[PDB]
Structure formats: structure tokens, C-alpha cells
Amino acid sequence: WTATSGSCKGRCFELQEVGPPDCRCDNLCKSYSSCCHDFDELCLKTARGWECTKDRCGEVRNEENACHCSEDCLSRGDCCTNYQVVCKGESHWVDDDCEEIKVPECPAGFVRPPLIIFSVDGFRASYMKKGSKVMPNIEKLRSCGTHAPYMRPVYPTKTFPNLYTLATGLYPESHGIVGNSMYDPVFDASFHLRGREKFNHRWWGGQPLWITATKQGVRAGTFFWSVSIPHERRILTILQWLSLPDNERPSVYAFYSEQPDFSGHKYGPFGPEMTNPLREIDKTVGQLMDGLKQLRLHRCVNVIFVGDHGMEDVTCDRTEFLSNYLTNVDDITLVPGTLGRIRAKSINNSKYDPKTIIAALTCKKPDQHFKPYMKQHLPKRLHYANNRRIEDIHLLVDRRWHVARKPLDVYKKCFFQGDHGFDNKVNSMQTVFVGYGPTFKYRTKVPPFENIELYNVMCDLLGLKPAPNNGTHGSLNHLLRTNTFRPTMPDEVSRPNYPGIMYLQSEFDLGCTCDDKVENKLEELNKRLHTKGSTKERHLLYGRPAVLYRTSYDILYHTDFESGYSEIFLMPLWTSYTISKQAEVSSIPEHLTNCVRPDVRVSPGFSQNCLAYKNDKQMSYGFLFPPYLSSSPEAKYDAFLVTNMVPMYPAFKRVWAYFQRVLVKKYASERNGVNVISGPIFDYNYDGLRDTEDEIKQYVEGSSIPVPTHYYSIITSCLDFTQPADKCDGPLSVSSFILPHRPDNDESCNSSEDESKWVEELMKMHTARVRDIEHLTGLDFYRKTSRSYSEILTLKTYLHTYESE
Ligand SMILES: *[C@@H]1O[C@H](CO)[C@@H](O[C@@H]2O[C@H](CO)[C@@H](O[C@@H]3O[C@H](CO[C@H]4O[C@H](CO)[C@@H](O)[C@H](O[C@H]5O[C@H](CO)[C@@H](O)[C@H](O)[C@@H]5O[C@H]5O[C@H](CO)[C@@H](O)[C@H](O)[C@@H]5O)[C@@H]4O)[C@@H](O)[C@H](O[C@H]4O[C@H](CO)[C@@H](O)[C@H](O)[C@@H]4O[C@H]4O[C@H](CO)[C@@H](O)[C@H](O)[C@@H]4O)[C@@H]3O)[C@H](O)[C@H]2NC(C)=O)[C@H](O)[C@H]1NC(C)=O
Ligand SMILES: Cc1nnn(Cc2cc(C(F)(F)F)ccc2CCC(=O)N2CCC(Cc3ccc(S(N)(=O)=O)cc3)CC2)n1
Ligand SMILES: [Ca+2]
Ligand SMILES: [Ca+2]
Ligand SMILES: [Cl-]
Ligand SMILES: [K+]
Ligand code: NA
Ligand SMILES: [Zn+2]
């Protein structure tokens, strides 16, 4: 019920929302069907349009008009945005030369520069260059302020997940808005774009920026706007709030445009009909900037122009149908389109089996345009699994395609030419970032970054402490002139032991053998020095990683590599080695094919054993430092130590051996040397975070050797590739991966072919940030470099995406 007989007199676009049954006057009342009877008349005036004309200048105030051109309008805060241009001889903001804003130039009574977020739906990154001739206001913000060539959205690349990620700094799996449509099985409730369930606060987790501000005594505008409020009135409303008295006036605001998304769905991303919507958005930016200039705020406010996601070419004829794969198609519910999510149609059907659905969808047609996954097997960089609202079965859809259940779903619902939602590394899904104002840098270009990082910066801009989030605070300090956040490196929790030779060979009963019984004072002192760390500066280039949790581990030194060996997990947490451009690749000699050697620094009780691998018919083993890259025949014996061994499915050994034998050397040739850090990851509950011992679901048969869910590598070199990796004076360059440790290669449809046709393609799909590996391992990397900590934070968030320009 609503008692719509109240009135909006003196309450238009009120900031405090009122409780039913009392009628509402706020910027969402229309969406709730709750506005007072007189809201249109009083709050949505349109008379005489949105621009002053020569004949209106100095008019007698008429309160019926949409905006004003009378002499009293500046003190009332309600002039048309072009008033000073038409009536007082001023220039439009876009026509003024740009001039560095070195300090905030704010009216008396402003305690801090306000922040205005101008958000645009569907604004693809390439529009900034391709549309620049028709967007002069936007082009000025871009060239004069701080800009990235693009900003990476979160997966799925849909509207609600991305706007709420911008507002919270959280991945969708943590904030709870995991699509535009959702079913929550604990609530037994469905969330949709249309309708009222989405207004229930239980869907929306974390803490959005407007709440963070309000809790810390910084007042906020209401961010949301009902679709029927025209853009001109949204801008006039912001400008009027900015004229409130000091104690009532907000410091943070948002504008939202449904364009260019709305037209992009109809016409495709570059349809000739797209020029007009871009023109219209630019005009809206111009109205805001002219309006700020009238209020003497144009060199006081920080403005962010940001998009949620891009737009791709997608038509009805590029649809794959599950009815062409499944016998049982009526026993499933599909969330369809640019991703798929599958669950049982009925919880009472005991003949539902996910294994058989997955198998019927795997590599069945030669050009198949989607790939099925159990959600825990999705690339870790997507962070798309730890939420009961994400269905176990997921379909990753190729760019330009849709998936649907049956053909009748597509013609009883071609209309559309654009859509979005695909993998967030796809070029067409990238969106925009520009920052302009006293707190941003002047004429500065910054590298691409992820939208999860912006909440921290918006908090910095307003002097707020951010709520706990998935950004890396300090990684975007290079965007800011002032208000930088200066973090300290985390303290190491566990210090290592440095074991010497403590065990005789006969103390070990591991069931291992090696043909190594082959015998010098020159070379003996030498090998002793290598075991005490004499080559460590070559192989550990950025210091040892720090262990940020409580555990027992040993540092082990060798000629060609250094490791941190866990006594609890019975394997290295990390293994570090450097491969120069000149390094040579060799084979594993015939006599050493099955060689595994006891490590006399590490007790039998804290070692793996060969017998377990023999008896486990599914599990084999591999090595973290590759025997192929040994510096000499004698050093090669170190690579077969039981302390360098890790458990590997034979199917995974195909991937790992090609990485180690072919790819590492290729990268050293291309990059002028590389430093490699490799290791295991355990994430059995798919939360993106290091497992404790009691979370491990699988062991090598009959032993306490835990099986990793994934294997990582971090590959570092000099950004100036004219210097070798091991003698680099300046910034670094990195690429990393987190490969799933699977007992089959079903993910790779071309795996019966030679590794040269499919392994590198797998690795590119599973590209990762250093920071992703940090979360998964409890390790902290790059502790000892010549670089500033903020620069290192930026390096740790880099993602190598393998898309062209
Ligand atoms: C990205 O950044 C975020 C934010 O920093 C990281 O997420 C945090 O990670 C922590 C660990 O997973 C987690 O800490 C736990 O908090 C529990 C209290 O949680 C409530 O309170 C907070 C604070 O206000 C709130 O934010 C939470 O909100 C979640 O849940 C509601 C719905 O209930 C949602 O609206 C919201 O979207 C959010 O959901 C997400 O997180 C939850 C987990 O909290 C997931 O289940 C969802 O799928 C979704 O992803 C909550 O309202 C606290 O109770 C925990 O303590 C347990 O564990 C410790 C171990 O130290 C143990 O000592 C305790 O005994 C206790 O265990 C008991 O409960 C167990 C389970 O019932 C039981 O088995 C035991 O036997 C015990 O009885 C814990 O400290 C923190 O909540 C989240 N925060 C958010 C916002 O998500 C995230 O990790 C980052 N991602 C990456 C990859 O780095
Ligand atoms: C989602 C989402 N998440 N966070 N925001 C706010 C936002 C954020 C950000 C920021 F700075 F982060 F970039 C910028 C702009 C907005 C406003 C978005 C807006 O104006 N739209 C119209 C209403 C629509 C339906 C709706 C109406 C009402 C409600 S609710 N449940 O809050 O009443 C939800 C969705 C949602 C889109 N939107
Ligand atoms: Ca959108
Ligand atoms: Ca985990
Ligand atoms: Cl969705
Ligand atoms: K075996
Ligand atoms: Na295969
Ligand atoms: Zn859209």
C-alpha cells in the first residue's frame, strides 16, 4: 500500500527515503510505483525545454519552467546549464584551453573536493578513439586528465554484476550479484531484471561506496535513477544538490546512462545508428561541465567517466542449441545467452547426473562454440565459483555466439545485433576509465587495470577507509596527484630452517632407486658452497617469498635452483630458478629415467616415497625444477631429489613436460632470460584462498602426500629486454599461470595431437595475476627489489591477456 495523497511540495529528489505507507519523492519512487500524486507536476517539469535563449535572458521567474534564465537563478541553483553562455557572454567549458589543476579551487565552505561518478552502460573501450570526432567534451576529459586505454570488467560482463563491483570492490561471487538473473536455493527465491524481488536487500552483500561514506560522516547523493527521469533532469538535480547549504550538501554523487547499451543491442557495437547515441552522451557531459563552471566548481570537483562493460556483434543465427546434444533436455533449467548455467529442473529427480550432462556437451561437434565446465574447473582468474547462486555446471560461450535450450526459445520470446557477458579478457567486452580533477594527474596515460581496484581509489578521493575488498590498495597510486595510500609490506609469519647434512642414505626406506653411485678436492669444496647458497643471487632475484601463515618449512639450496620445502605438505611451496638467453636444453639420460634420490638434509619422516606412486595406479610424479635445464651433467643429479618431486596425473604430465622442455627456453630466448617461480596450489573448496591441511580431499594412495588442485608459475624478466633478466636496473615484466591439475585433457578438444598444437592455448586460457597466486598460497613475492612498493603492487595485479591490440 501507498497513501499517494501526500505531496512532494518542497521534497523533490529528497535524499532521505521515507517508509510506507507514506508516499515518496526520491529518484527511485517511479520504479517502486510509490511517488506522491503531484511528483510529475512539481519534480518533473519540462516547460520550455532545457536551454536558455536570448529572449529569456533576465526573464521574470516563472516556477513552471524546467530550468531558469532569470537574474536570481544562480543564487537559487536552478539556471539552465547554458545560462552564462547565452546570457552573460561566457564560453562553453569544452571551448576553453585545458590548464593544469594543481590545487583544488573551491568555494568557501567546501570541506573537500566533491566526487561525481558519470557512469555509461555498454560503453566499449574502442569508442574513445573511433567516436572521438563526435565526442568533444569526453575527448577533453580524456586528453587533459588521467586515462587508461581500457579498463577490464568482471565476469560475467553483464550490467548488474559490474555496477555493483564498481561500487564495492568485490568479485561477484563475494557481493552476491552473480548475474542479471539468479536463483538462490537457501531463500528459494528468484532475482530478475524486471520486478520487485531485486529490491530486497538480502541479495546485495558487501558495503557499497554510498554506505561507506555515510557511516564515516561523508554525505552521499542517491546513486540510482528511475528510467523515465530524463538525463537533463538528472544533471539539473545533481547541480541543485551542489547548491545546498554546507551541512546538507553531499560530497559524492553518481549519474547513470542506459546508453549506449540500449542502442548497441539493437544495432551492434558499430552500427551507423550508434553515432547519435554517442553525440547525445557527449552533450550530457557538456551540460554537467558548463553547470559546474557556473557554480565555480569546474576546478574543484573530481569527475570519473567510467563504463560497466563493452558490446560485441551477436545475431540469432549464431545460437547453439542444447537440444542438439542432450537426450534429456526437459530435465534441465538453463540460464541462457552469452553464458550458460545449468541445474536440475526438479530436485525430486534422482536420475539427474551432472557427469553425464557434462560428457554429452564435451567436444561433440567440430566447430562447437561453447565449452562446458564444472564451476571449480573454470580459469581461476574469473573468480566465479564460491557462491551457492552459481550453478555447478557452467558454459563458457565463444565471443559472437549465444547458447539456448531449444530453437523455440529464440523465435517465441531476428531483432538484436549486439550483446555482452562473455569472458572478461575478450577485447570487445573492455570498457572505459577517465579521471579528471585536482586529485587526478594532468595529461597522464596509465596502463589498463581491473574495475575491482576503483572502490579503494574512490575511498582515497573522499578520505574514507575502504571496507575489506578484492582490490590491492596502492596498486593505482600512479593515477593520483595527492591522497596516495602508502601501504607497508606484510610481516613474515614463519621463518625458515636452514638444514645441513643430517641423515645417512641407509636411514631412508622410500622404495626409490637411482643409478648415481659414480665418484676431487677442487670440485668438492665447490659443491659444498652451492649447498650453502653460493649461487642463490642468480636464482632468487627478488628475495625469498615470505610465508604469511604459521607452518614448518626448510630452505634448500642447489647449483641451479632454490626452494622452500614444506614439512607439512611434503613438497615445495615454491621453487625459484633463472634461465639465461644462452642456456641449453638437454635430455633426461637413459640411466636416470626413473631416478629418485633421498635428500640427506630432510628426514625420512618428512619425505615423499616412491612406493606410494608405484601402488597408486592413477597418480605419477613430476619435478618442479626441470631436469632438462640442468647447467651440467653433475648438477642434473640435484633435479632428481625426492624434495623436488610433486604428484602429477599422467595426462597433466604431458602439459607440464612441454612447458618445461620447450616453453621455458622459448621465453628465455624471447625475453632475454627469465626467472621462474613454480609450485603447487590446494583449493579444494574453490574459495580462491590457500587450503589448510584439513581441507584436502585427495592423497596419493596409501600415503600422507596431498594432491594439488593446480600448479602455478610466475615468469619475470626486465621490461627493457636489452638487459638480461639477472642484471636488470629498472621496471620488471611478468606473465603467470595457474594450470588445473586434471586427470584428463577433456578441456582441450585437440589433445590427441602433438603438444605444439594445444598446450600453449591451454596455458593462455589459464593466465593469472601474481596476486591470484598470493591468495591461493599465502606467499608474498617481490620482497627485495630496487622498485617502489606501489610499482610492485601494480606489477602484482598485471594480467597477460594474449588478445591482439
Ligand atoms: C574478496 O574480498 C572479500 C572481503 O574481504 C573476501 O571475503 C571475505 O572472506 C572471509 C573468509 O572466506 C570471510 O570471513 C568469514 O566471515 C564470517 C562472517 O561473515 C558475515 O559477516 C561479514 C561482515 O559483515 C559479511 O561480509 C558476510 O557476508 C557474506 O554472506 C552474506 C550472506 O550470508 C552475503 O550477503 C555476502 O554477499 C557475503 O557472501 C559471501 O561470503 C560468504 C562467507 O562469509 C560466502 O559463504 C558466500 O558464498 C559469498 O561468497 C557475512 O554476513 C565468519 O563467520 C567466518 O568465520 C568462520 O571461519 C573461521 C576460520 O578462521 C572459524 O574460526 C570460525 O569458527 C567460523 O567457522 C564457523 O562457521 C563455519 C561455516 O558455517 C562452520 O563450518 C564452523 O564449524 C564454525 O561454526 C569468517 O571469518 C568474509 O565474510 C568474506 N567477506 C565477504 C564480504 O565476502 C574474499 O575472500 C576475497 N576473495 C579473494 C579471492 O581474495
Ligand atoms: C546494479 C547496481 N549496483 N550499484 N548500482 C548503483 C550505481 C553504481 C555506480 C558506480 F559508482 F558504482 F559506478 C554508478 C551508478 C549506479 C546507478 C545505476 C542505476 O541508476 N540504475 C537504474 C536502476 C537499475 C535497477 C535497480 C533499481 C533499484 C535497485 S535497489 N535494490 O538498490 O533499490 C537495484 C537495481 C540499476 C541501474 N547499480
Ligand atoms: Ca550494462
Ligand atoms: Ca581454499
Ligand atoms: Cl546472468
Ligand atoms: K602410479
Ligand atoms: Na581432449
Ligand atoms: Zn546490455
Residue type at position 251: S
Asked whether the CA dihedral 53, 59, 65, 69 is positive or negative, the reply is positive
Residue nearest to atom 10 of ligand 2 (CA): 167
Ligand 1 atom closest to Cα of residue 175? 37
Nearest ligand 1 atom, CA 775: 94
Q: Please state the atom number of ligand 1 nearest to the C-alpha of residue 688.
A: 93
**CA nearest to 335, candidates 204, 205, 178, 189:** 178
Within 8 A by CB and 6+ apart from 119, the residues are 163, 166, 254, 255, 256, 257, 306, 307, 308
* CB distance 212 to ligand 2 below 6 Å: no
Q: How far apart are CA 312 and CA 158, in angstroms?
A: 12
Closest by alpha carbon to 423, among 376, 370, 475? 370
Measured from the alpha carbon of residue 691, the closest ligand is: 4
Question: What is the distance between the alpha carbons of residues 455 and 536, in angstroms, rounded to a whole number?
Answer: 40
Return d(Cα 305, Cα 299) in angstroms, integer.
16
Measured CA to CA, the distance from residue 665 to residue 661 in angstroms comes to 7
Bridge partners for 121 per DSSP: 260
Does ligand 1 come within 6 angstroms of the Cβ of 470? yes
List active site positions.
159
Q: Quick check: CB of 657 below 6 Å from ligand 2?
A: no
Q: What is the CATH number of domain 505-797?
A: 3.40.570.10
Please identify which residue in the block is written with the cell numbers 561437434: 365
* Angle between helix 770-777 and 789-797 (nearest 10): 90
Burial of 351 (0-12, 13-18, 19+ CB in 10 A): exposed
CA of 653 to the centre of ligand 8 (A): 42
Specify the resolution in Å.
1.7
> Is residue 697 packed enough to be buried (19+ CB in 10 Å), middle (13-18) or exposed (0-12)?
exposed
Contacts of 413 (CB under 8 A, 6+ apart): none
Give distance in angstroms: CA of 694 to centre of ligand 1.
18
- State yes or no: cis peptide before 407, omega within 30 of 0: no
Distance CA 494, CA 632 (A): 34
- How many helical (H) and strand (E) elements, i.e. helices and strands, does the chain have? 23, 29
Q: Are 147 and 158 in contact (CB under 8 A)?
A: no
Q: Which residue type, as a one-letter code, is found at position 514?
A: C
Q: Are the C-beta atoms of residues 494 and 552 closer than 8 Å to each other? A: yes
Q: How far is the CA of 344 from the centre of ligand 4 (A)?
A: 26
CA 566, CA 573: separation in Å to the nearest integer? Answer: 6
Q: State the residue for C-alpha cell 595426462.
A: 651
